[PDB]
Design a protein around this ligand. Sequence first.
Ligand code: CA
Ligand code: CA
Lengths: 251, 257
Amino acid sequence: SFIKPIYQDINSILIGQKVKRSGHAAGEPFEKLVYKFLKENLSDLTFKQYEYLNDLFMKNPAIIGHEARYKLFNSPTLLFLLSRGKAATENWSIENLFEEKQNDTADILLVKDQFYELLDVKTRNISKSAFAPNIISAYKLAQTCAKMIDNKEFDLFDINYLEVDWELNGEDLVCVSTSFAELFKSEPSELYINWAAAMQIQFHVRDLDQGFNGTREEWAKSYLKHFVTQAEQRAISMIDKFVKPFKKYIL
Amino acid sequence: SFIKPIYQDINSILIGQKVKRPKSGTLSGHAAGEPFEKLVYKFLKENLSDLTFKQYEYLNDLFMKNPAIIGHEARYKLFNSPTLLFLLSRGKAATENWSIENLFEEKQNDTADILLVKDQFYELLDVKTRNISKSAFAPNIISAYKLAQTCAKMIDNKEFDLFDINYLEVDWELNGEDLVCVSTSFAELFKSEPSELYINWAAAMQIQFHVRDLDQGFNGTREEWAKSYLKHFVTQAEQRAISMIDKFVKPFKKYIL
DNA sequence: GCCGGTCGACCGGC
DNA sequence: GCCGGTCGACCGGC
Ligand SMILES: [Ca+2]
Ligand SMILES: [Ca+2]
C-alpha cells in the first residue's frame, strides 16, 4: 500500500477538518479532502478513477475505438474493475472526457510502477449506533477473483479502505477519527455478504481482521468458496422467509 | 387520494416553472431537482394545511396530542391499526424515549415522504423528481418484502380502506443555469396490476418503475389487489432463489470443486 | 427493447 | 452481541 506509509499523517491532517451539512446522511465531502491530502503528498500517483481513464486515453491518442482502448489496461481484471462501457469508451475524446460516475469501483486510485491501489473512502457518523456500511458488491468481488485466477493476476492491485469518522456539532461535521484496512489481509470465509443490500459485503473498517497469512491466490479461492456457499444458503433462507410465511394468503 | 382532486392545479402551477441548478455543480441524484420537491410540499402546506405532514411530523403530532400516553406499548395503540403501525412506527426504544424535548427527526428509511391524513384515511405520498433527458434507469420504489408484510396485515386485520400509496413525479430539464419543469405525473400503486410489478431482488428487494409508466388499469378490490400481489411476490421469490443458483453458484464451482 | 447489478450509508429486533 | 432489511438513484450488455 502506498497509503499505509503516510497514514497517521493523513490521520492527523484529517482530524479537526469540517464539512458542512446528518439529515441527508452524507459525510461524503470528506472523500474530497482525503483526495486533497493525497493529491499533494503523492502527486504523480493519485488519480480519481475518472481522472485515471482520461490520462490513460490522453497518453495514447493514436489509439481509438472501444476494442483497442480496452487493450490499454493490459489486464482483463483491471479492465473489469475500472473500465467504462463500450459506447462511453468508443465516444471518449479529449473534448468529451470522462466525469465522475456513481458506479465507479474506487474513489481514489493510486498507481505506481504497473501497480494499482484501489482506495475507497468510507465515512461513519460515530454518534449513531454501529451499522456496517456497504463495502463492495460480493458478486463483483466474485467475478474479480475468477478473473484473477484465470489470468494469474495476483500482484497487480489491492483494494484498501479508509474510514473517516465524524461527529456533528450544530451545523458542521467534524472528523473525530480515521481508520485504515486492507481487503486482501482479511479472512475471506469471514466476510459478511448482505444479499438484500445490493449483495454488498458489509463491515466497519475499524473492525476488519487483518490477519490473513496465505497468498493472494489462496485468498481468491477461499472467498469464492465462501461466496458460493453463502449464495446457496441465501436461496434456502429466501424460501423460509419470503415463501412459507405467505402461503396461507395464497389460494 | 387528496392529491388527485387538485392535481390539475399542482400541474398547472408547476409547468414551465424554473428553479436553480444544484449548488453542487453536478446534475445527478436526489440533489438535482430537490427544490421542486420543496415547492410541492410548500404548496401542500399552503392548500391542505390540516392534512399535510412529513412522516416524522405526523408522529410528533400524534404523541404530542395524547401527552398522557406513555410507553411504546400504549403509544403504539394510538395508531389504531396494526397495518398503519407497521408502516409508520419508529421502533420500541425510540417510541419509549420520545418526549416533547426529544422529538422525532427525518429518518433515512422512513416509509413515507409526505403524509396526507384526514378522517383516519392516509395517503402515503412520494413526491419524486426526474430528469427525462437522462433518466432511463428505474428507481427503487419500495421494498417488495415491506409490501408483502403490508398486504398480509391488511388481510389479517381486514383493513382495505385505511390508506393509499401514491406518487407525484416532477420531470425537469436543464436550461444552462436553471431547471425547467417540463411535465408532471401522478400514479397510484393500488391501481397497478400487482403481477406487473418488477421486483429487483439484488436492489434491496425493491419494486422498480418510473411512475410515468406505472400501469393504472386495475379494477378489483383492495383485498384482491393484496392477495394478488402476495401471490406474485411468493412466485417471484421462488424464481429468484433458482436464479441465484444459476448465476452465483454454478459459474463459480469450477474454481472450488 | 428487455433485465438487473452497484454506490452510499443507516437501526432495531431477536 | 449479532444479523440483515430500507431508502434513493443510477447505465450498459445483450
Ligand atoms: Ca467510497
Ligand atoms: Ca421522494
